[PDB]
Amino acid sequence: TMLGEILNYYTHWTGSLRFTFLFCGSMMATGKILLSYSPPGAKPPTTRKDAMLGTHIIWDLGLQSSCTMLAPWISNTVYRRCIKDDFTEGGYITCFYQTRIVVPSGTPTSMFMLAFVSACPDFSVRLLRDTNHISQRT
Amino acid sequence: KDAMLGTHIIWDLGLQSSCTMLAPWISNTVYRRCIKDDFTEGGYITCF
Amino acid sequence: PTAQSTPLTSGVNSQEVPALTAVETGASGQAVPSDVIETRHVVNYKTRSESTLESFFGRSACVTILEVENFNATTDADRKKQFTTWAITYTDTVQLRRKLEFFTYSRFDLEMTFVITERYYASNTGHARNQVYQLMYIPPGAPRPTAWDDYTWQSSSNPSVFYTYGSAPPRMSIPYVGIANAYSHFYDGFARVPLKDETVDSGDTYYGLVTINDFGTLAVRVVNEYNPARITSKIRVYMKPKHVRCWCPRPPRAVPYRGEGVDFKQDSITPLTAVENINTF
Amino acid sequence: PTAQSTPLTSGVNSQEVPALTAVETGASGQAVPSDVIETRHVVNYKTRSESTLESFFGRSACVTILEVENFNATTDADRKKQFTTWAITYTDTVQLRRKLEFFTYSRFDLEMTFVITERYYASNTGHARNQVYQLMYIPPGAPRPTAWDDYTWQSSSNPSVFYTYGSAPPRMSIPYVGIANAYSHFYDGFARVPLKDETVDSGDTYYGLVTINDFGTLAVRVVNEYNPARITSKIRVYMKPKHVRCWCPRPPRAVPYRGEGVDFKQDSITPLTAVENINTF
Amino acid sequence: GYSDRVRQITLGNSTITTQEAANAVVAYGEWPSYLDDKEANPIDAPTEPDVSSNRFYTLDSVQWKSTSRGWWWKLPDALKDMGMFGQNMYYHYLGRSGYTVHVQCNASKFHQGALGVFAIPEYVMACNTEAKTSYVSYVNANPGEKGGVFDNAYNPSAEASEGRKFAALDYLLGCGVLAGNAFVYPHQIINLRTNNSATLVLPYVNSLAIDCMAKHNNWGLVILPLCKLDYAPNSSTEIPITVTIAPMFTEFNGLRNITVPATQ
Amino acid sequence: GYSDRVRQITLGNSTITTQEAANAVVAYGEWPSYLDDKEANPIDAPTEPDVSSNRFYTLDSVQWKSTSRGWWWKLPDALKDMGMFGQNMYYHYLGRSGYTVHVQCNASKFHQGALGVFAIPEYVMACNTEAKTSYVSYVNANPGEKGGVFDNAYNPSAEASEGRKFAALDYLLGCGVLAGNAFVYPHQIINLRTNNSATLVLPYVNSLAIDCMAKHNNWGLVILPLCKLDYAPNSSTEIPITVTIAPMFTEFNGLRNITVPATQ
Amino acid sequence: EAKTSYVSYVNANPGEKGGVFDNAYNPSAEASEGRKFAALDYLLGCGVLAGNAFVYPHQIINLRTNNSATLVLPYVNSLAIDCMAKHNNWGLVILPLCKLDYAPNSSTEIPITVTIAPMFTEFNGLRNITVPATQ
Amino acid sequence: GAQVSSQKVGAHVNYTTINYYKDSASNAASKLDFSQDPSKFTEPVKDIMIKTAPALN
Amino acid sequence: GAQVSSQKVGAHVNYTTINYYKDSASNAASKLDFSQDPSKFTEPVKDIMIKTAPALN
Ligand SMILES: CC(=O)N[C@H]1[C@H]([C@H](O)[C@H](O)CO)O[C@@](O)(C(=O)O)C[C@@H]1O
Ligand SMILES: CC(=O)N[C@H]1[C@H]([C@H](O)[C@H](O)CO)O[C@@](O)(C(=O)O)C[C@@H]1O
Ligand SMILES: [Ca+2]
Ligand SMILES: [Ca+2]
Ligand SMILES: [Ca+2]
Ligand SMILES: [Ca+2]
Ligand SMILES: [Ca+2]
Ligand SMILES: [Ca+2]
Ligand SMILES: [Ca+2]
Ligand SMILES: [Ca+2]
Ligand SMILES: [Cl-]
Ligand SMILES: [Cl-]
Ligand SMILES: [Cl-]
């Protein structure tokens, strides 16, 4: 992602992450979707009844096409590391049907949503470094 | 280890001979009944 | 100036719905945590100091490795090893190039630094006296050397730096020298319009910035005449953009470069590693 | 500000008994000579200047010795001698470590200094031109070199110092770079919580600061290509904490270290020499 | 721009959106609140868990079919195993709570049906044996998040021991009153042509300031199909109903060891 | 009454209406404008053709299918044969222009799909031979109003002479970057359930005040199906995409005989 | 001595039972058998002399003087807040500085009881419950 | 012609700059510029969007 | 921006400092800080203990 690519020039990050979802079914499709952020240190959620104990939003599909779920800054350290690291693990984002998607006849029964990520205004990075995303033969 | 999760006092024996433990008023109803009654049960006093 | 503090907020039960939007508008999501959770007050003293363009670009990056030698040359090939010429570019290496290419246009002054290293080619050919290097900037149009000791090295007008081996890495500043109001990192076009029924070749013409860019030539020699011992040298060229402005952000390079253009290589266009499942933590 | 002067005092015959106390309280003894003897007036002009934390830590201490070589490498093992990488730590040596470990937490800027030395591996393989060294700081996540001449050394963003053999020891300052509000010298914990019935290995996991600390890597090379004469180099790394604050004092290390943790060695846990008698002057 | 149909609700770390609401009900016109010193009863400093517990918990979804007779839950019973709300409830003798109830049911402009959504104070229901009166087991009265279903038939048990469950008879609201009069209780209707959600904000309701949550449910939540689900291309279609409930202004007294109710 | 969904745009003798818009984008927050004396370069009195050229030109429509990988155009290339704009462009050495881009795609409340509509400054694309770099013919780079299409496969030519066209590989945006990051460029989405049009207002963007329009395209217009077209009654259905573009604040310098570019 | 810093989570986190010191150090033959603390009394289980433990906040229970010790502890860390399930902020050490002696019965035992109240507790990052490994 | 400016804070004041060269290109790094306007990229919309209001009315 | 400060006395005046660098981390040693409060370690008791009074009354 654009955020991921910028973070790979830095060692440290802090702040809130914004996840925005765009439903791209037909206008005739309805539904309720649960979007959850579970801060770390417990069983990763694989069921709605565990996911809904964390930070979450119930998204009602409708005229407003898009729903924003926040992963608010919830961390022991003041910065997390821009690497896979148990000590600065960030937790778990999951998604469940709250009801289900319902369509009438003559309507696609399968469809998609798009997920976007961006940094919030509380977000900053430190300690410039080379990225592992570009290299050349020698 | 169950008793110490409730309201409790640790009494050190010494020159002051006496220790007061309170059962503070903690009830659903505004009054309890002066009979044996599940609904107005008052709870448990223990000592270890 | 600091990154955003978090205000104290409790819950809502309201016709105000900051959690919903419509990204069809071209607006990104805008909601912040205080819009969708109960928040405490947190004073944010942290700053975005290290992600300003000056901070992001504030590094000397290696952009090329040049080679020159000093020995008694008896063939045309060996005479051409006594000096080197390099068309000035940031496309010989990938790291600084990729950072610049977050942007379409830029304006900056340049700090150029050089690291010069030597080794003996052989033992039992005696030794070599300490070498002086000439690095001559040849702007477009100025005559290019054809030998290490031709007239061009007198450098009456071209800037030259004379570097003594073992001294501090040499360094100089270059102004913003662009003939436009900014440098173009990308140019969607050609150097000339090919016209109806002209006889000019259209089969071997190029496209983009390579057709219009010319920052001149760096020429390097060892000033010393040959010793019995052949010495081989590397000159590493470093660039730091300073006093930086940039315009029109771009997605960064996701796959290997294969030259000076945006072209990609058929065996290297799969940057993502497939996940086992859409549900993999 | 000076250490305490002694007041003029004579004797006492009093219900005031400053000689007695009760250290069960957790208070140390407080009595001073004027409490228990007749004292003259002595003006104390002496100061505790040299035992401030800045004074105690105000020294460049050797923290490691690195090795690099420059020769024509024909095997994988010999190619790996052309550069070195070192995880930055103060635990390779004992002297600075023991001083820091008087404290639980610290905050300081760092002066890093390097001493670079060479010797000829052999005679009758000729000579070697003066060598330039690159010392590259690789922050966690930045790509680590696999060869002395790979792309990582172009160092567009990583800080590098180019050092010319025979020049003044190179030196730079590092800010307080901790991701916490202080450095932890001791961490009574783990990097992750192992959870009920998880399949993750619990048999080969570690404990303490080693599970969470990462100050990145120092990579060193000789920039020069090989001479006929093999040159072997040592790089001594020096650290001086400056602008120092420390918290939560600790008993100092009483027995030899045996690694990065607080572990002790069975043959080295008897620091005291037994006295002949409790009555030995 | 602002609409009776479009709403955001944020409590703690949880947000709900709806784009096809029909206003929102505040039961008896009263927002929940903390217990005032002038109405207080237990004298210990209460626990007010705030954002840990006062947040949206989503129950297991149920399926609305053309044959469904309806669904019931009790509160706080439905939330007794929900995160820190459940822990605070069972570690204390006493608790009080308001709620935001958000019932979710979307379909299409071609579906039809209407759900009555009722919040009922002291929702006492009939037992299923005529050998006894008021003869319901704790376990059957307190099903938790699964709740229960209504039936359109009353078949009381041959033996008293087999009838210790609710006779949840739809048209008598499981309690001997006509379902058509349930509108005297705080309610919304989810009429699929109009709206896809119901929102009810409930104050604490009781004859006491605070009570034993593990003994006593303050509210029933009833969802009755007033008009059956119909969909012309498939009369056997099912659409989910999802219930999401946030405790509000939670306050607990009488801390001790944890309550672990009988499961049989 | 006024709505983010309902818009009228009038330029010269041309008007667009939409009743299902989603606001409008002004690229980098900057409306186009004429070139100020304090930023000017060529010194001849410029031609400002105004209403003759600064008006909506409708390109040939393209068909969106379930198998479409997307479409690209360059500007001012796409408008080079459009009325008096084309004549002013080719009679002058130098030109600058902003644009109103209006992308049109209607369907039904039963169709689904999403188009990303991106305006890309200096939209440089990869060539289709690995024997050379930056090896694209003028004719293939400048297709005019027909534009080009993306592919989901990269098949570079055996011979350099056969590969002098763009490798318009969809997921690399035809230029070695991931398409998911195209949102850093000024954009809208046509999501068929929400909107039937995208409107982008573009200022002149270049490292110069004014440039050779016949040599240099300032903008790429990219339309990518982010979510494929789907329609349950006919998966093979096609719906048109129509592109209508108005030059704005056009200014030309260096009048001479007309430029007639090579066609082969 | 086959490894460094080699302690299992379960042995590091015994809970209310705590652990005991020993006056002998007997490191394990096999690395897998030595993943517990070497709680050697005179080195305070950490390679420093126990006589210097008085630099830490302390009291002494000297039976002739007192029957209790009270220590009030602020939060101490290099962070404002941290993962309690990963990281212990404080150790509590009780060392017999002078051995228990009772003339009528040298084998007598007297209880030591530890009572601890958390104070000014504050928690962030609510989710599902952490259930640590027990083996 | 000495400039005295605030240093970037460390673990636990001011610094002095004199320019030695007649060309600004010779100067050290530009002073920290905290300017930003993310909205030109994150919200480049013609009509104001109020977060609490519907995006489409 | 020269600082003039007292030197540490020798066998038998002032010195001048100018900071040359934009980062405080570059600066020479912190000035002598004679701050101390031994009582936080030597006497961290809740109730004041007067030396002349009994420690336990
Ligand atoms: C660049 C290189 O490899 N040079 C090597 C030379 C060349 O092979 C010459 O051809 C023969 O001297 O040979 C050596 O044995 C030598 O001269 O001592 C080692 C030296 O490193
Ligand atoms: C590091 C070391 O011990 N080097 C020694 C070498 C090596 O043994 C080589 O293998 C053979 O030259 O041998 C010497 O006799 C030499 O070359 O003059 C002495 C030299 O100090
Ligand atoms: Ca909104
Ligand atoms: Ca809020
Ligand atoms: Ca020469
Ligand atoms: Ca005393
Ligand atoms: Ca005296
Ligand atoms: Ca080398
Ligand atoms: Ca609270
Ligand atoms: Ca005109
Ligand atoms: Cl070299
Ligand atoms: Cl010359
Ligand atoms: Cl130029």
Ligand SMILES: [Cl-]
């Ligand atoms: Cl995976």
Ligand SMILES: [Cl-]
């Ligand atoms: Cl050496």
Ligand SMILES: [Cl-]
């Ligand atoms: Cl290099």
Ligand SMILES: [Cl-]
């Ligand atoms: Cl750190």
Ligand SMILES: [Cl-]
């Ligand atoms: Cl002795």
Ligand SMILES: [Cl-]
């Ligand atoms: Cl339950």
Ligand SMILES: [Cl-]
């Ligand atoms: Cl055309």
Ligand SMILES: [Cl-]
């Ligand atoms: Cl325990």
Ligand SMILES: [Mg+2]
């Ligand atoms: Mg449950």
Ligand SMILES: [Mg+2]
């Ligand atoms: Mg045409």
Ligand code: NA
């Ligand atoms: Na702030």
Ligand code: NA
């Ligand atoms: Na004194």
